[model samples]
Target: SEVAHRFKDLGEENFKALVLIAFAQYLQQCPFEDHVKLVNEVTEFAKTCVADESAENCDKSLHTLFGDKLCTVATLRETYGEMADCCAKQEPERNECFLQHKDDNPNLPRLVRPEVDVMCTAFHDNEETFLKKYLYEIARRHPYFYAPELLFFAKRYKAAFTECCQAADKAACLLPKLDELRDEGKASSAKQRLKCASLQKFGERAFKAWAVARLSQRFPKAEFAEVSKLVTDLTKVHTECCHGDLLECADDRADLAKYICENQDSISSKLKECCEKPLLEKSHCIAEVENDEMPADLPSLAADFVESKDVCKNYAEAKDVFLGMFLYEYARRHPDYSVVLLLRLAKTYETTLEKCCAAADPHECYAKVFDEFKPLVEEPQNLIKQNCELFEQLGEYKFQNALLVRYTKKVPQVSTPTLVEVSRNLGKVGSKCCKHPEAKRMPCAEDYLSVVLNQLCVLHEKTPVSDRVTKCCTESLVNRRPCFSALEVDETYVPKEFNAETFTFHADICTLSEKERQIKKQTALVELVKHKPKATKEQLKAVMDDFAAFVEKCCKADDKETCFAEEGKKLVAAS
Candidate 1:
């Protein structure tokens, strides 16, 4: 009924032709088991309806026999209809007619000249039954093969098909036309051959010209440039593999290598000359030939960063062995020291060294390590804050001492008692915040600084200058006391440069207390949440709640900000 609705204009004769052609095509591809089942079923239907070939009688029985599968029929209506009609007729005559129609075409010159000639020859005297089936199948398989190139190949296929048919060479008729087209395709330009070869190699279904065009439009120029090179390489590789006459190419390895690398020095010189020239020239020249690897140092920094943080410990023992060898073998014996503590310190230096070393030479990697570790050692407070496991191991007092030293370095001047008191107050507040279940675990020296600076700056105005000053002085600066340098602040520094940075710093220390970074992120989340109502009310609350906890924990007790900027950022990303 469904098929009848769609092709209702197709009359009874066409419909009968449709069913028989569809059945024949199915039989052509279907396995022998299914073939046996279909033949049994259809032969019973044919025998029952043998007395009637009238449209009215054939329609009901064909519908009963084929059902939905009749719709799969293609354009064989004119050629196969007479055969179809006779095959549905009575007894011995019907059986004889079925045999004849299956072998020879009564409807000769079936369609166009090329198709007619192919089918007529294919069906003549069962001119090789498999070839007859193959011709019928290919015609059925690709009904729209009208391109001149395709027809050109199709005509050749017909010749091959007929030859195989006469010789009863079934295998030749069954071969895919892809290779044949590829061989013919060699006459085209290298680009065209490559594109066609790609289709043949990966399969035509996987790649499409339309998709390629669309992607070319979608991608940036850099990406598109990369893809173009990739296409060229793929095509070159395919040609080498498929068309190189593998045995011959294998034998001619010396010859092939010479052909491929004939201008090695000239090519290298040209590339080297381009590199020494300007950037634009280098890029264009590089594009003309093949490109090579990046310099070793480019990935070295990134590799160092990755390895130091995660796998540095794994390499620590190896690096120590190298150092021990250097000292004993080259330095000619080492002074005896605390080997346990010395090794630990050496390992610590190695960790920082690994993070900064460039993969140029050992001398360079080591030279940079000194410059890198200087700042890292000075900022041990920050180092502890960044890693929670260190915080747990260092205990509260040592962590406080490191933060105090860093704080004093930035501030300059004051009594040890005053600095200790300030450190204790800030630590008390920090402990409360950092201990929270959902608070950010990382200790922030910046957070401590903001709090300490706020408290100390206020105390300096009230306390006497003598009381603020202490004997804490660095040897390099001679008479300048560290406490005096730290405690002194420019009274007019606030008013002269009351820019956003000042306002933000002041806001964190006194007014809002939360970091400006957290504030901005929070404000952004609140505005974004307006449009994201799919965000559960619980989820939205959690965002603000997390923000509140951060400000409460990190900011001073008086700093009462409703949300933190970092939590806002985290919420927006999660949403």
Candidate 2:
């Protein structure tokens, strides 16, 4: 009922864009009357939203537009958040406000069109079915894109279908569009990441919550109960795989991946082609499948869900399972929240319950705390964007230097060694991510950087370190990176004073192992930086340049001992 009411409020504001998009989608069958009927019907009503300022007429147009189109008010409002300002305006304002404000992100056109064989086979099997669905799909997938481009693609798609099917090698004939098709799909995913990136926050309960209503409407053949297990497993692979945990992702995803791929007859049937591929190739394919949004029928799992239960008993008796279900029920229905934000929603619920369950009006106190999910996750998205931008601009060596100094100022401990290691490790992640353009070098870099932070905490846990290091390490993953970035170093502990011994170069060290030999080389450079911490990087570059050149010159010497003793002294004085 609340979901019903929620959609009720969304009537005119959400309805306009919803209908027009379906109109654009229907136009893919340009020869069909469906487009003509939908076009005039929608336009005439939109005329009233301005003339009579009749918002009701706009909703009526949307009602019939979505009614036959299998669309809903909830679907429009929830999936597209960027259109709010236009949607909020009056009918006269609303009509014009949309297109300029619509999915203008140039990134949307990059759609990975379907495989050649699938299109070819279908085109021949039934021209009627193939063309319409193809038109239906590319447009639906890229609603953020313009109708003119949508029409352009359909005409091009139709022309290709006509030309390629009769060619000597149709595979060769169709192979040309494949590159451009893959082009649009990937850049297209940049905007689609809202569902992929944002839904990941609320996690499983929310995930299943989302998948249930979304897929239930998406697949008419499947019942809500029939696909719960299917939805649950796909949910696992999505959450684990997308997190990029390195180990956690592969371990759980491989297990869940096979099951979903094995059982896709009813839901996501197009995924079948991907499912049949070699096991290794299929994991990524499954992960890339978008989790479409919940329809107008958003779940009524509620505010009343909180204030009315034996709050702690189930929470205590089967803590994980109960809260597991609790989180699912909680998150599934709330489609608007972020996984990170909704996670806090449940965290606050459980923590508040731990205290309030003993109160006289326990549920009354339980009513408290949803203020948590209210704010949008603005900082978190921008956090990595800014970091990755700076990371790309800084280049490799300077970025590494910037990383180490930033840490030195944060953790109070006198150790440069740990932060050096963390800096080197973080560089591995940055170099991995920044090798790509800033546009694609998002969320993944942010995640990898955090995963490295996790490892750094593990670095501190095993090794002895400062109060500030230990103290800051205790912060949550979300807070830890931001925390350390700003943390001030203790002024008390200083870099150790060094001599030629600090570089620790030796002839025998070079002969121990190829790996061991690099330590002398690496150690020499590391010490040069710490010993001459106040020196400019270029000055340290000069000192290290001498050491490296001497190593090059002296390593080949007949009397290595004399070579080292003579050069090592100068190196110490120079540094």
Candidate 3:
């Protein structure tokens, strides 16, 4: 019976570890009949171990129960390493103490784990042993991965080897498939990090709304009732999966996936392709589908936002579901905004209700919460199009400089660091999203431009801003950016005497990279506009032309510093 003699002389800690490892391995591979036998063996072994903690008793009991296929005592000892000396007369306390001792999640660095040839041979030698070993190693590798996902990885490894080992070109199939599995694992892990971040950032209710908004925009063709069920199952994953409830997440996730496949009639015309794929591949495929066209005559956007008359009563009864419905309704109506903005607005709505609905005049208190929604963003859309088009024409470096010079005149009293932050964030927005398809680009650019404008408003709060900034900041936060965009230069404002020292061109300008050199050119231009704030648009344009010519002559010619000195003064003269 003692096929595993190396597992003899196991301490209670090591003995429990061996049985746990063995027990877990069998459970995943078992059929229903085998499950009956499996639980019986485990229960019988548990009572025997209780009656006696002798090494031989532990070894023979474990050996008999697990079909002599347990991971060794040495393997158990090395992995667990004195796992809490928790075998005193404290039954539940001792059990829980052992369970509670999880290691900090020090994830493994990337590597060719279980090496292809190594795993291939290991599997051929004994597939069951190697599969258990892979589970142990990967579980230990990503110590913080929940049980459900870890089991997924186990199933992945076993399935990969089981079929691939039979191939004529085993390494060829094995290597590619295994690498793909690794890539999916990385993506899955990253998605978990993002989901948990939102969980922490938005708290539970708003996070639920985020998923609802996300899916509603993804699948516009679904009936409202179906969308309701879709949101419930998908949001359950964040509740169960984001935290540590592995079994609950697994069941809920499966239900969601199954429901999507079977009932996505109107959800996607391209839905058939995703269903034929593996579970992981299927998830990615479905998530990436474009929205179906908005159906004819969606209910009034305002109507969907209003529920049963008592605002606090309905929400208090079902905060998660109610907020989710609210978000979906709002998103389906205005699919023009980014999910990021939609989520933020939902967070805003929930937070407002938290205070307002409890007050005496709850309707009075909460009535204007939707004021955050309405915006005359027509001018702001014009600003985004102009900025984004210029970004395309001028390229990133030049585009940033163009804004630098403009913002320089716009906010003369504001610090250079603050203006740089503004132009820089706006530059990032334009550069990244401007070239996206017309359908995607508008909201993408609008979303982040609003971010830069919001940041500018925040900066204005702490600093002395020009009158132009004050004009925008005086408007509501939702209206500030459009007001800021629509503002014109103050032609009546007086100009200071032209300051030549304001333009500081140095020898280092010649030594810079093209991007850095362009930055230098823009820096000089911004300095000119800031110091002589009354410069006409033509005068500013003239200085920009002069700087571009200065770069052509000074940077390309041999006497770079001397050229910069003489040519820079000509720009001062031009100004």
Alpha carbon lDDT at 17, candidate 3: 32
Q: For residues 330-449, write the lDDT of model 2, one tens digit per residue.
A: 444543333444445566567777777777777677775565444424455465566667777987655665566555545535355555666766766556765665444543465456
- Model 3, span 403-430: residue lDDT tens: 7766776666666657775786677777
In model 1, the Cα lDDT at residue 386 comes to: 55
Q: Can you write out model 1's per-residue Cα lDDT over 1-575, one digit (the tens) per residue?
A: 22332123333332333333334433333332343345344444444444444433445523334532322332233444344543345544443343233321122233322343455565565644433343344323322111112323444555665555455544545344434654443222222323333344335322232123222222212233343443344334333323311112122322322332443342233345545433223333343443332223223333443324433444454764334322222111111111111223344555555664434443445444435434433343343245334345656644454344433333333444455555544444345344533212222332333334334543453444433332222121111222333443322221122122211212253354344443354333323332342344476557556544654554553433433343334534553
Each model's TM-score, in the order given? 0.16, 0.42, 0.48
Which lDDT values do the candidates have, in the order given?
0.36, 0.52, 0.59
Question: Rank order by TM-score, top first?
Answer: 3, 2, 1
| Candidate 2 error regions (>4 Å) | 1-258, 265-270, 283-322, 325-345, 357-368, 373-379, 408-421, 428-443, 457-486, 490-494, 501-575
Regions of candidate 3 where Cα sits further than 4 Å from its true position: 1-202, 223-263, 275-284, 301-323, 340-398, 406-425, 428-441, 448-513, 523-539, 556-558, 569-575
> Which has the greatest lDDT?
3
**Candidate achieving higher TM-score, 2 or 3:** 3
Model 3: lDDT equals 0.59
Q: Worst lDDT window (10 residues) for model 2?
A: 241-250
Candidate rank order under lDDT? 3, 2, 1
